Amino acid sequence: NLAPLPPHVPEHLVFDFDMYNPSNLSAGVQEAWAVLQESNVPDLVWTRCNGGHWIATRGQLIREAYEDYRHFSSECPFIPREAGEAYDFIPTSMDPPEQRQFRALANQVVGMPVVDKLENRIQELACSLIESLRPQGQCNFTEDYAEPFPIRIFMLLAGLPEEDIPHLKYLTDQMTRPDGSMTFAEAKEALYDYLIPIIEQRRQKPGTDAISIVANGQVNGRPITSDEAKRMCGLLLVGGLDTVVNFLSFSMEFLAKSPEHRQELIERPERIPAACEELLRRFSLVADGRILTSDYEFHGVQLKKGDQILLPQMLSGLDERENAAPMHVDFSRQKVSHTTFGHGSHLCLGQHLARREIIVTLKEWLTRIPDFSIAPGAQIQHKSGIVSGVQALPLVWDPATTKAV
Ligand code: HEM
Ligand SMILES: CN(C)c1cccc2c(S(=O)(=O)NCCCCCCCCNC(=O)[C@@]34C[C@@H]5C[C@@H](C[C@@](O)(C5)C3)C4)cccc12
Numbered sequence: 001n002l003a004p005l006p007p008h009v010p011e012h013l014v015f016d017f018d019m020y021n022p023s024n025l026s027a028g029v030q031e032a033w034a035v036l037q038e039s040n041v042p043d044l045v046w047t048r049c050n051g052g053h054w055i056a057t058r059g060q061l062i063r064e065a066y067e068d069y070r071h072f073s074s075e076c077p078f079i080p081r082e083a084g085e086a087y088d089f090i091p092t093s094m095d096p097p098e099q100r101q102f103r104a105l106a107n108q109v110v111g112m113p114v115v116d117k118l119e120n121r122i123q124e125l126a127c128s129l130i131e132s133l134r135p136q137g138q139c140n141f142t143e144d145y146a147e148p149f150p151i152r153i154f155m156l157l158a159g160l161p162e163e164d165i166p167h168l169k170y171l172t173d174q175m176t177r178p179d180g181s182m183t184f185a186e187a188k189e190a191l192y193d194y195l196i197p198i199i200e201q202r203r204q205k206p207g208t209d210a211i212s213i214v215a216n217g218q219v220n221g222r223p224i225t226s227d228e229a230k231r232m233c234g235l236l237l238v239g240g241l242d243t244v245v246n247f248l249s250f251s252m253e254f255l256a257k258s259p260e261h262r263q264e265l266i267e268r269p270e271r272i273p274a275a276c277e278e279l280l281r282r283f284s285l286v287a288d289g290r291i292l293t294s295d296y297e298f299h300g301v302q303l304k305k306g307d308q309i310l311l312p313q314m315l316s317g318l319d320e321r322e323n324a325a326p327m328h329v330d331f332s333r334q335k336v337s338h339t340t341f342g343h344g345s346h347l348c349l350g351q352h353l354a355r356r357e358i359i360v361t362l363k364e365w366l367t368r369i370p371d372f373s374i375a376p377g378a379q380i381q382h383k384s385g386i387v388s389g390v391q392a393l394p395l396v397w398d399p400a401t402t403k404a405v
């Protein structure tokens with residue numbers, strides 16, 4: 001359905017982009033969004049899809065809106081409006097100033113010093129998954145490596161038992177891959193039902209895991225509440241799953257299809273960190289947004305209080321104004337500009353953990369299974385949304401060209 005054009009929106013700014021089903025998704029999801037950057041498209045447009053909303057199409061405006069939390073609030077960060085409204089995760093549904101110290105607390109459990117300590121456990125996990133796949137000469141990468149990898153890292157961080165993985169995967173999938181059978185609010189309650197008792201337990205008998213640290217933390221000069229701890233834990237769990245799963249999948253699809261780029265990393269593994277950054281730019285995948293706190297004129301366009309604006313993190317690095325020949329992958333790009341991990345006060349806290357997951361995966365995969373392809377006859381299908389992704393990724397290789405390391 002197209003929503004009726006609100007009378008403050010001029011007709012020349014209307015471009016009916018559907019973020020959940022863009023036209024020619026078949027060409028690749030990044031390509032499908034990049035239609036918003038063709039020369040006849042304004043910097044700021046209105047779509048009548050999904051209830052109707054603004055979209056900033058260029059890196060400059062995306063960055064500016066993410067900086068201006070006074071006008072562009074995270075209270076309602078999702079399209080459609082109803083999903084944005086039910087959402088109470090911390091710190092993502094909060095604005096500064098209140099967000100600041102909640103962010104600080106979350107940083108204790110996923111920040112840089114935690115990542116340095118986790119490095120080897122990440123590597124051991126990646127090695128075990130890859131070795132289990134290696135002799136088979138095939139996998140669905142998305143299902144067989146990408147899905148099991150970040151959830152296992154979360155269990156380690158949060159001191160949760162291995163036996164809980166399938167149940168927790170079921171609860172998270174319900175929420176982030178909705179099939180229309182339940183509202184966000186319903187899926188959130190089912191997730192909270194799992195987390196609530198564990199938080200109770202760890203406030204009574206705290207350990208040294210991430211949930212204990214969060215649930216017993218201090219925020220704005222007082223103890224965190226049980227409610228706030230649950231809202232934080234929900235985000236700590238969800239934030240590192242679909243992003244990492246889908247990003248690894250885009251990266252491995254590209255490498256399967258590009259033996260010349262693959263060969264570059266096989267011959268020069270020291271370039272893998274730079275390659276990781278270039279892939280983060282080219283296969284950027286997140287698109288959330290904000291809600292107007294007041295009427296506001298922004299780059300010559302009148303916005304009204306309560307309008308939603310999609311600010312696609314994906315688009316900044318694809319903008320030719322930010323990076324020349326933006327669809328071309330070059331691992332030696334001198335200045336790799338992107339907002340893949342967002343921008344402003346909510347810039348991803350898990351970005352350091354994410355880069356280690358990516359670099360460790362690429363280094364270990366390329367060492368053990370250097371030569372692989374898309375399965376004969378397969379066509380890769382993408383999906384579009386708040387976190388865009390890969391539906392399935394069938395890969396094949398000759399086990400004789402691999403090595404058990
Ligand atoms: C490729 C991987 C990742 C991508 C592309 C990504 C992307 C993002 C983006 C764009 C935001 C900001 C959203 C907004 O401004 O509304 C964000 C926030 C956040 N991310 Fe990530 N993320 C990734 C991995 C992770 C991981 C592994 C974790 C670990 C739990 C994580 C935890 C968080 C947290 C806690 C926030 C909220 C920070 C705040 O609100 O102050 N992320 N992420
Ligand atoms: C017709 N109408 C009115 C409709 C009704 C109902 C549903 C509809 C859908 S829908 O069924 O596709 N629903 C929208 C998708 C909701 C997903 C939110 C999940 C929250 C967890 N993620 C995070 O917190 C985040 C928070 C940060 C930013 C990202 C990435 C993160 O890492 C970090 C995790 C998200 C589509 C179109 C229309 C619909």
Ligand SMILES: [K+]
Pocket residue numbers: 075076084085086087088093
């Ligand atoms: K909300």
